[PDB]
């Protein structure tokens, strides 16, 4: 509740976010905004360039691309699980509650952090070596095209907040420590932690974006949506299953969705 303590928490979480996630928003923007020879991505925009991209950087194309998403998603869950452990107080919660918070939190965090890798035209892939265009994804067959586009619609809205990684490190932690996840055993100690994180987020946003009116409230409002867009995801994912048994759902994802 003391400023120096809230700033200390901001640095701790930012430091841990750098250690846990391979590809930051700062690196992503450097790649997307060019300026560079060395950091420049190969662009996948159609079938032919996809085949060349796998050479530079079988199953049906939309399925292959889907598996590429789930593979990274599984990695994100692992990365996020590792980040959570660094949130002061998280590993001291009831073990069942830790599982519960991760279970309902990872998807919201994945969307949030997927936005870092996106602009209105596409998404970084392969740790930023590749870039796949929105239009190519949107044009995939049967339901897979409509499956990719909502991610971009969110990202375009979220990125207009212009958060940097030090903002996102705290925002993500706030998302994890939500006392309103179904099935939680001890809501109060989770809310105690979130209160501290909310305080830290509030002070971080004012110092880092002093000219951004009510960014805190606007950022919390975005924590609103994620909840509904995650529902659409699992919904579309369910229907995909009921029509695509040519699909590998990783056990970690498998159990998250049960």
Ligand X SMILES: O=C(O)c1ccc(-c2nn(C(=O)c3c(Cl)cccc3C(F)(F)F)c3ccc(Cl)cc23)c(OCc2ccc(Cl)c(Cl)c2)c1
Stretch that binds ligand X, among 10-18, 86-94, 117-125, 213-221 (CB under 6 A): 117-125
Which H or E run includes 119?
strand 118-119
Rounded to whole angstroms, the Cα distance separating 157 from 222 reads 9
- 209 annotated ligand-binding residue: no
Closest distance between ligand X and the C-beta of residue 151, in Å? 4
Which residues are paired to 133 by β-bridges? 122
Interhelix angle 165-176/3-20, rounded to 10 degrees, is 90
**Phi, psi (rounded to 5 degrees) for 234:** -65, -30
Binder of residue 102, out of a second copy, ligand X, none (CB less than 5 to 8 A by kind): a second copy
Print the binding letters for residues 38-77 with ligand X: x by CB under 6 A, - otherwise.
---------------------------x--xxx-xx--x-
Q: Give one DSSP letter per residue of 163-198, joined into a string.
A: --HHHHHHHHHHHHS-TTSTT-S-HHHHHHHHHHHH
Closer residue to ligand X (CB): 99 or 247? 247
Closest distance between a second copy and the C-beta of residue 221, in Å? 29
Closest distance between ligand X and the C-beta of residue 199, in Å? 27
Rounded to whole angstroms, the Cα distance separating 63 from 233 reads 16
Task: Provide the terminal-to-terminal Cα distance of the chain, rounded to the nearest Å.
Answer: 38
Which residues are paired to 119 by β-bridges? 122
Closer residue to ligand X (CB): 6 or 69? 69
The two three-digit tokens of residue 114, written as one number: 């997927």
Total residues contacting a second copy by CB under 8 A comes to: 33
Q: Tell me how far the alpha carbon of residue 215 is from its chain's centroid.
A: 19
Binder of residue 176, out of a second copy, ligand X, none (CB less than 5 to 8 A by kind): none
Stretch that binds ligand X, among 1-9, 112-120, 181-189, 221-229 (CB under 6 A): 112-120
**Phi, psi (rounded to 5 degrees) for 96:** -60, -40
The label of the residue with tokens 């593979």 reads 71
**Other beta carbons within 10 Å of 111:** 19
- 250 annotated ligand-binding residue: no
Interface with a second copy includes 253 (CB under 8 A)? yes
> Restricting to residues 46-105, which ones interact with a second copy according to CB under 8 A?
67, 71, 74-75, 77-78, 81-82, 85-86, 88, 91-96, 98-99, 102-103
Residues that bind ligand X (CB under 6 A): 65, 68-70, 72-73, 76, 107, 110-111, 113-114, 117, 123, 125-126, 132, 137, 148, 151, 237, 253
User: Which residues contribute to the annotated binding site for rosiglitazone?
Assistant: 70-73, 107, 233, 257
Footprint of a second copy (CB under 8 A): 12, 15, 18-19, 67, 71, 74-75, 77-78, 81-82, 85-86, 88, 91-96, 98-99, 102-103, 250-256, 258
């Amino acid at each position: 509740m003391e400023s120096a303590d809230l700033r200390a928490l901001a640095k701790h979480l930012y430091d841990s976010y750098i250690k846990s996630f391979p590809l930051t928003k700062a690196k992503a923007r450097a790649i997307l905004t060019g300026k560079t020879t060395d950091k420049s991505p190969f662009v996948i925009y159609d079938m032919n360039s996809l085949m060349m991209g796998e050479d530079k950087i079988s199953k049906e194309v939309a399925i292959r691309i889907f598996q590429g998403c789930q593979f990274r998603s599984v990695e994100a869950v692992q990365e996020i699980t590792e980040y959570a452990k660094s949130i002061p107080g998280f590993v001291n919660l009831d073990l069942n509650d830790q599982v519960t918070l991760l279970k309902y939190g990872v998807h919201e965090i994945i969307y949030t952090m997927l936005a870092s890798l996106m602009n209105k035209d596409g998404v970084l892939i392969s740790e930023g070596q590749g870039f796949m265009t929105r239009e190519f994804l949107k044009s995939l067959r049967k339901p897979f095209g409509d499956f990719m586009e909502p991610k971009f619609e969110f990202a375009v809205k979220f990125n207009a907040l212009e958060l940097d990684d030090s903002d996102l490190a705290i925002f993500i932690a706030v998302i994890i420590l939500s006392g309103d996840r179904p099935g939680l055993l001890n809501v109060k100690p989770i809310e105690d932690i979130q209160d501290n994180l909310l305080q830290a987020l509030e002070l971080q946003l004012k110092l880092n974006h002093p000219e951004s009116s009510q960014l805190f409230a606007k950022l919390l409002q975005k924590m609103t949506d994620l909840r509904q867009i995650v529902t659409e995801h699992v919904q579309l994912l369910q229907v995909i299953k009921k029509t695509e048994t040519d699909m590998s759902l990783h056990p970690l994802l498998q159990e998250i969705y049960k």
